[PDB]
Subunit: 253 residues, 6 copies
């Protein structure tokens, strides 16, 4: 338990595949973490998961053997710091549209002098022991979300920020801001082109790029295109679709 | 909202198909209730769902448009009464092995003189209004679980109990008590024979019979065999299987 | 804080008036406890209040200056003991129909040798300090509910049980068991006669008698009749009625 | 369930009357929603109601048949977005003192291009179905609170903001900022004059105006004066007053 | 994680030392589990810890590296089964006074044919994988508490019950039932003699014996006397004592 | 209960000693409040304690007889206001680095005209009664944390802010920002010198100064040096250390 599993993937030359949870609770969190996911992201933006509910989920994901990540409600330093101290080891912050906002994200992820993270690592100290402080930055992964035309306009400046590992595309909001339907795994040409451009710029910068996916097949293609961090697919969406199919099968003549 | 949707299926000559939840929370409960399920059963036996977590789930299922059912942890009258008053409108009680235990279940489901249910129907009174008391028995469905060789031995006496609608087979415990593996949707001959026998005896008694299913295809066959109430399939099992397949698809060459 | 406020009323020659809560939460609990109520009863039978929600409510009632009481879901010794150790100082147990059931209630309320209460008084020890054990019995009030024709039949035997202070009439269930509507504050002659009889028998036995009331005027009359413990009226009922009147006043021409 | 009940009142030429909850929990929320309230506002500013407790309350209000509204703790976009995605369909934001702050509120309530609301409408999509995005703005009501002399000074500029329906007066804070006692339903002339002025300016702008009321009679007068959205009265205040009166009636000679 | 750490101690010829938690929450649970405790017992009898709060604590203890145990509120089969399925791997049941009560405890801990445990091992299946059923009995430790003169009278019959590992002395209740003060780590001769007798009888029966301790020094002596399972000391007691000493040190001249 | 216990210490010429809680829950909160602590600080920054969990803890601390304080996650006005209205009577805000940030803290603590605190004091009104508004400022203590080189640089300007009582040193973050290990109770000369300087400047300004301590002996020395508010020591740290010692004592030969 003495390495961030996602950073280990990267250091060993492979991308990371992560789950995505919008449903609160520990039981499915542990169960999915025990599958061949490198990380499980808990969504605190588009879900009813508040801090009180995320906290035990982090424990359950770690026990199950995946790295606990959180997609926060907002890029707020103190919110992020409190998640880090509760044992979130990856942070995906929404709506990072400028270099300054990316610097605000980075500031929360590193103790002085690299950042201004406040010191009181209740759960990381239990995981990593006495040597935590010297390795703390490496234990956390940080990605800025790219979800607007403004973020696209500022992508090179965002990617130039030290202390974030790279960017995570939110393609539904991106489609909407471009005037298209917010369809997951879209084929809309302007959105597909923007996604490819963000990936190309991130790799030109020597940074990591991730993307939210709605299906296993789309995730496979994103991995083939070279994305470093791919999520697939939300618990609620997979569960709904599975139940709809069970009903169709049960009710068929 | 002025009828129990499962009793309406039966009264209109069709069986009922129900979901099965072992994961706490309201969001997937509502989402699954809005699918073509007549009822959604919340499992309080083989899950971490306690009373505090079941209570909002009942609300969410009703809002979504399925009848809220609970499979209780135990056949205990006061537990059942408190669920009824919180807006559980179907009760499946585990480990009903004798006529006396079936009578104990029935006692909880009916006000005097048919039973001894205590009066204080906080949520049913809001749903049904001033005429609730006169229709209360019809608003609730009750099924005794058949899960042991003892329950099999006593099946005709259990089915003779007034004030339960019938029985619900728990085929994993039944297999185990017969010395076989607790495989859902089993083909083991002795278990399949016992299941068919329970159904035959329930219908000979003019009662309803249900069964827990692990798949849509098995549920379809159970409906074809004449089961009146079929559950398919647990949220956690469907979600796990869906995630495992998404991972396999994403990681494939 | 070194006396049970209800026992102090009795010892000083006056009855006790108590509130009644079916809504979970601490804020209204404290607010009502600060009114001229001697006790506030938290209903864990006909409400969604589970142990996790009752526990902080007990604290809030004590801070507000009323004695915290609980009407339990069932007459179960271990449930009652855990409430006592969480700082419930009055227990009203439903559906006590026989002397044996009354003895079961009494057993939970007293340490050996008078009863079999298990020792680990987390919150009473904080309230009462080192001398708690020697005074423990006096710190708790216990009342058996009388809610059925069977309990009426056995009233003298129930009242003969040492280690309960007396009985608490539940007049809605009593009406129902007699074949009448479960109207609070009923005028139905057979119910009114049964209520008076229970009071007379309790006083002939030198015991205390209480009754659940739905209105202040009915409570006043019950106090005038000599009831020792009167509750009036449920939070939810008072709040509903108040809101209905505010709406009528607001929407009037 | 395919319209916002408050907007329907307005579209049909009538004002809306709403409840106001400072007590957490679902049971009174549903019960009050089933009364003749068009909406029920949950107060997350002057209450102990956090996100974890508001979430089930929204479900309960909708089931009961009133539109779920929230008065937030602060005018924060991401907080508001997460409430919208949990099924809050009306937002009242405190302490909106400038046009810029009003624009910040409006930004959270509309998807691009009218605003920057992030896309992931977990509960609205369940309520409204596939056509949600095209109707999303109409499904939500937004009101900026007017609670300071500064907000009074800027009232015309605040009212000029597209994408909020209007303003909601908080008359206790307004009184305090003017140097008067924070009495609900005040008669203090300067406060009464400021309230009338805000209403007049809102109607001159073709916008809606609301006000918090402490009594049914005051609410009736506010409706007669032409307020479009009137709240009356807080659950805790109504419950306290009702209990105080029950005690007075019970303890009277 | 594929063995019960307490059974491993025993199988390797050493006793087990366990912590004892009366405070709800995961953070101290994990922290104490990471110390040199073989197990951590969560007290659900003399604490405010309900099922909803115990569930995440079990996860946290396992992550920290101690075996999660529960001292239940009561010897109730269905309560115990639900704890087992939530990942409690040791059960200490209070107030086991007869062989029949010991048989009731054993019945809950073993699948058929050795017992009647119901099948649905949500969390054990995640821990132990597909081979769980064949090893399930070995994964769980069960101890009956000896806390009364009656249990002392029946000690040999209790120890003769197959399917419990042995007994756990509760010396405060035992002292009380003998008419002595309920002092932890008592020197009262009759209590000390009864404790020694229970240990001697348990070892004569080839069974395990445990005892609750209030201090490290007493625990050391109990280990030297040959107790197989020693708890020391309750979180709340240790924390209180530590705080009292910090205050005394801070306030000293 | 009609005075802030910490302000009473100061008014009577003595410093205040306070506890420090990072573990959620009411039982240890009450127990520690009943010790000779003037206040108990609940840490909402470096802990998993969210609003839903802090709220009952405030009640428990007040019942136990210490003043409830909160160290917030961030210096945010609306967060602070909601804590005040839930009965936090002392606020310690982290990372106050400039006079403007100190003014933002002060603004939240006082009603107009001294500040802009919003009016709706649910719990203070219950504690203090009708005269609350006129005494509200005195009922609350506010301290700005000094945790960075920037805050050191701006210490005199921070201390010049009306409406905060003074400053609270966070010496672990301060050490880190100076390039030293974040050891509690440090002897590192530059940190010790900075701490003394902050105290000297606070007293030159006629203000109060506090410091977080990790031990009773260090706290004693800080009191001797003239600190006005000393915390010692975190619940989790004291509990861990106590358990480690119990284990060492139990396992010793
Ligand atoms: Br897998
Ligand atoms: Br999706
Ligand atoms: Br469907
Ligand atoms: Br299954
Ligand atoms: Br009063
Ligand atoms: Br009533
Ligand atoms: Br109405
Ligand atoms: Br009001
Ligand atoms: Br250790
Ligand atoms: Br102890
Ligand atoms: Br002390
Ligand atoms: Br420390
Ligand atoms: K994994
Ligand atoms: K449905
Ligand atoms: K009182
Ligand atoms: K309505
Ligand atoms: K360990
Ligand atoms: K104190």
């Amino acid at each position: 338990h003495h390495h961030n599993k996602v950073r280990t993937c990267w250091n060993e030359g492979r991308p990371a595949l992560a789950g995505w949870l919008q449903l609160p609770g520990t039981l499915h969190a542990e169960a999915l973490a025990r599958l061949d996911y490198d990380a499980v992201v808990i969504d605190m933006q588009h879900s009813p998961i508040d801090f009180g509910q995320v906290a035990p989920m982090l424990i359950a994901i770690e026990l199950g053997g995946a790295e606990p990540f959180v997609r926060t409600q907002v890029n707020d330093p103190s919110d992020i710091m409190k998640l880090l101290d509760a044992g979130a080891y990856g942070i995906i912050a929404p709506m990072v549209n400028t270099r300054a906002e990316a610097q605000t994200l980075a500031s929360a992820l590193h103790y002085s002098p690299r950042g201004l993270r406040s010191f009181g690592p209740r759960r990381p100290s239990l995981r990593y022991g006495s040597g935590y402080l010297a390795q703390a930055s490496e234990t956390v992964v940080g990605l800025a979300m790219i979800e607007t035309r403004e973020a696209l306009a500022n992508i090179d400046e965002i990617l130039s920020v030290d202390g974030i590992d790279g960017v995570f595309i939110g393609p539904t909001d991106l489609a909407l801001d471009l005037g298209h339907a917010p369809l997951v795994d879209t084929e809309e040409a302007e959105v597909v082109s923007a996604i490819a451009h963000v990936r190309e710029r991130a790799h030109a910068a020597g940074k990591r790029v991730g993307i939210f996916c709605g299906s296993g097949g789309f995730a496979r293609v994103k991995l083939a295109e070279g994305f470093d961090f791919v999520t697939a697919a939300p618990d609620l969406a997979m569960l709904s679709a599975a139940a709809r199919q069970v009903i169709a099968d049960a009710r068929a003549l």
